[PDB]
């Protein structure tokens, strides 16, 4: 059929048989939301990524997004904008939108898996649907006159954008520049370019853009706590009627010509540049951007892991289907004979290897991704996890950077075994892995660089948290690991899980010594990245683990045919992660250890 | 502008570490003196930033069009002009034979030669292989093929090598093209071949030899059957050259790849179209697999050159970037929100990046020139004292690690590269993006590297009797055991060196105990890649060790400006590498020993 390759069997078995997501469906704020219908939701939306949202995934990277000079604007290739209205006629960029804005209620864990599969089959499709949950946060953080205008937002479908880098602002928001200037009746005209922004133009998709731009007021402090958020709409509109009015003075000058994603338009943005006031208003009618503007920011860290883990997978699994009827060379065995039978490659140990080095950390991956949207609902973390919802949105905090970060990073680097497995046919256009690696890389630099998400997930998500988010998670696997067919794993595990938090002992040394010696906090930055990979490293590790548990007590009460054949990948993944991929974690452990500064004193001239 | 050289480093290695110019003047090179070498050096480099430089954009922009009527192929005019920058300086025939118009060289100096090609635009070196193919169709012809080899040559004619087919990749010896022997002595070849480099060249030659693998009818199976044809694209003249009537052998398609796109990569039917493709038996002997593995052995040695060099290049371009892009505030005082701002290289983990960059490089760029002193009898003998017959069998052990070490850590390392842009790196602006996509085909062609693995234990090591690792593991133990300013780096060098020798002893015991149980063999292919992977590392490791206790001659001698900066960052790299990348070798050791075989028993049906 199409290149994306779909797995709602994992999704189900991670939602229901691991996690228990369906213990609250059908309860509060769920009521009218059955196990069944979860079920069918993810099937049809499975069908739809695989059937007319994958349709175009092709023609965007072949054809794709062209700037127009003429009239400031994109065009986007005919075939994607019929994806784009399969999306829209299906209702799927409401899914998760709060009930008053259109949506229908359900738990992030069943919508994040429902958005995997746009995530896999184009996700560019996804970026530019992701209008009406935006309005949504706007709506959360506006005053009572700008949640009508939210409201006509999110049920007009405008798309939306989220401007906040600049030419010299990028990793450090706090030096942005573009200004904002107070008018007599309280609106305000946004004035700087900006640099990067995604889906700031979309054809004719949409009837409006709501852009949501960081700017400086004129007069206030520096760094991020001096900037503020406006809403900025592309056309100025009736705010009770929401008709379309005159243009407003924001406006694509640029299209980037990129490695990937290349059917998502990435524009430079123009405020108040072209002869027109960029009118904005103050969110909340309050200063404080940089806390709104997170929300947007948490959302989009969200769906960038979700977006690597997606893609990682359809990777495993078409280079799977491929192993599976490919004849080259003889089984191993009979490696001599030089007139043995020829073999299927997946008969190989180094394909076997390569493939189940995929599917673990694929599998891994979703399951960490769901672990970690079952703390963004207080209803369904204290159901599943008996957590309260202070401690909920700390582990969830705690997480994000690993669903950012080592997603972004695992799903890239084992796409490479992915496209091996082709052999010289992997590096044709003609099968889909080479752009799943094009699209991929983008993962690990936009919504923050990976050195952002390990900096935010020691100095904040740690060390500011006391911890506690930690602490919490390492009790659990603690748990897990005091518990005899997972012995061998849990004996590797506990090496693993000692090996992380001697890693996180080390580093906060490092750190309270900086008090005494400033240069010490460089050794931090050293090796904050390879701590946060040894962390999703632990995770999936004990996740897999956890799955096995669940896969021998169903073999056990008697699973047979592709039930049982699935149980038994579980606990083959498991086994073949701890033994593998764990054990590295005690030399990381050890270089961590041993840091020292040389690096850092090195004369820049000697590089 | 793309490419940026390292004359410094190569001269370094040449002249400073292995010594190659005391060679140079005496026995085969008496009349190429030590400033004439580093003359060369020089005049490519400039040449390669240049011209040849100049259309690596284009070639990936503006790629081949197929005319499948004529069969040829169209190059862009700027690439065009690039090859013939490249064949009127003389750089088609860098280390031709003297009697077929080359200047006698070491192969050391002629791959750092050919390196500031692979680095600027490889498939410009790729195109321009035909005189060394000549040489060797020389080496291996009858007399009177001899004649015709030395036309090929001095024509600068261009070549192909013919082996791959749809079902016959890494199963050489499963291919059916077949050969038809006529009665005067020449052969019609008969088959449809694929993944053909070169196949069509446009205008750029007057001629292509193509060498083709086929079976002569009735033949054995397997790559034994098999012998090796001289087959032109047009016939010729065999006294004076002149170019006759079109041989039977055509273009029928060219791939459309993720990278590497100049290079026409290309189906090729022989004897399809009603007209004979005539072949004349290499050698007039059957010999075909070992013929052919004379020119396998160059493609793998110039595959692991390319992804060193563009590996090269893509730090030097991070490099620049990271001096010049000023982000965020020193992390000594990045809770202070005024701090100053500070440029990227200032920050701990862009250090670690670069430095990882750098000493992967420049490690890599150390083994291909180590290799390559091998080559030469002659060298061999005058720079580490070793005979003609051991001298084979280490360049024979090394040619795995350059191609199936070089080709994954270069790919793998370049996302350093890029990610040390931020999210400029994801632009086509800048050709990181490219160098990728460019590299991902070196894992692959020439053999992929799981073969190169199974090469280096079961030929190279255990069939070699274990004699060259054995010299390669002495002269890292002697550099062990002799200041104690590199203290630290050669204990970690020993824990190292003890971690291989494991790792080959655990291999080696896996392959003894398949005498009692075959399936005991699927150990060894399991672990065969992480063991020629964690040889690379060994290597590098202690040559820039050996690299570093140069430097700090060099340094204690009175070194000064450019010089002492150099050469602090040898010291600098040696010591990086020691410490954060050798210790890792020791969880793959232990990873190693506890290889089974559950991840082959387990039902292909439960992946
Ligand atoms: C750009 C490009 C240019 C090329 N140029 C040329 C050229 O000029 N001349 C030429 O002759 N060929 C050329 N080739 C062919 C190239 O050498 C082959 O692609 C390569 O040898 C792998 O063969 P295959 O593609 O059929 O993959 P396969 O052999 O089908 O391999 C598929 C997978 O199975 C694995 N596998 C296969 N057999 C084994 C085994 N016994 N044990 C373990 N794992 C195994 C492989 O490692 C790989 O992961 C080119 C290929 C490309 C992509
Ligand atoms: C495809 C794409 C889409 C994008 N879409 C949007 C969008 O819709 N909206 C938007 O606002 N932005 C968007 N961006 C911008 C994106 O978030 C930035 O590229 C990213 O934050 C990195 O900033 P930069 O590119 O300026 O890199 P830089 O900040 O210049 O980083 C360069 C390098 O320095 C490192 N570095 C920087 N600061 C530090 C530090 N303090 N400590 C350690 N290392 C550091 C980085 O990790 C990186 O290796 C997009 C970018 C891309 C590529």
Known sequence: MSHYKSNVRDQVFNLFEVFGVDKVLGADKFSDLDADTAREMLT??????????????????????????????????????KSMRALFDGGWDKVGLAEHLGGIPMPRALQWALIEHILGANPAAYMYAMGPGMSEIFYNNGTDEQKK?????????WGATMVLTEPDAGSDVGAGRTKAVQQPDGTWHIEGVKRFITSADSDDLFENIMHLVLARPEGAGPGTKGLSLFFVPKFHFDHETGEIGERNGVFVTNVEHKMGLKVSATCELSLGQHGIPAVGWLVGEVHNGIAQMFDVIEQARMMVGTKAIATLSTGYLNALEYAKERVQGADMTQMTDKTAPRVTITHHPDVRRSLMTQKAYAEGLRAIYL?????????????????????????????????????????????????????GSGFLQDYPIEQYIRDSKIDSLYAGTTAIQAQDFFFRKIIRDKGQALAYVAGEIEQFIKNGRLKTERELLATALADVQGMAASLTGYLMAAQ????????????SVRFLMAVGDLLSGWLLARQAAVAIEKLDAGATGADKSFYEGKIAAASFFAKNMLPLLTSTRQIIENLDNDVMELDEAAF
């Open 149 to 157: 205008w939210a409201t006509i937002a999110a049920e007009r479908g």
């Open 516 to 527: 005494e010696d400033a240069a010490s906090i460089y050794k931090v930055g050293l090796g």
């Open 371 to 423: 672990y970690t949207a079952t703390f963004q609902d207080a209803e369904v973390a204290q159901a599943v996890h008996g957590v309260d919802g202070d401690l909920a949105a700390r582990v969830n905090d705690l997480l994000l950077p690993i669903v950012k970060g080592f997603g972004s990073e695992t799903a890239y680097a084992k796409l490479t075994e992915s496209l091996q497995t082709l052999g």
């Open 44 to 81: 049809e939306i499975a069908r739809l990524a695989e059937g007319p949202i994958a349709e175009s995934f092709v023609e965007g990277d072949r054809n794709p997004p062209v700037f127009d000079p003429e009239t400031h604007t994109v065009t986007l290739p005919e075939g994607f904008k």
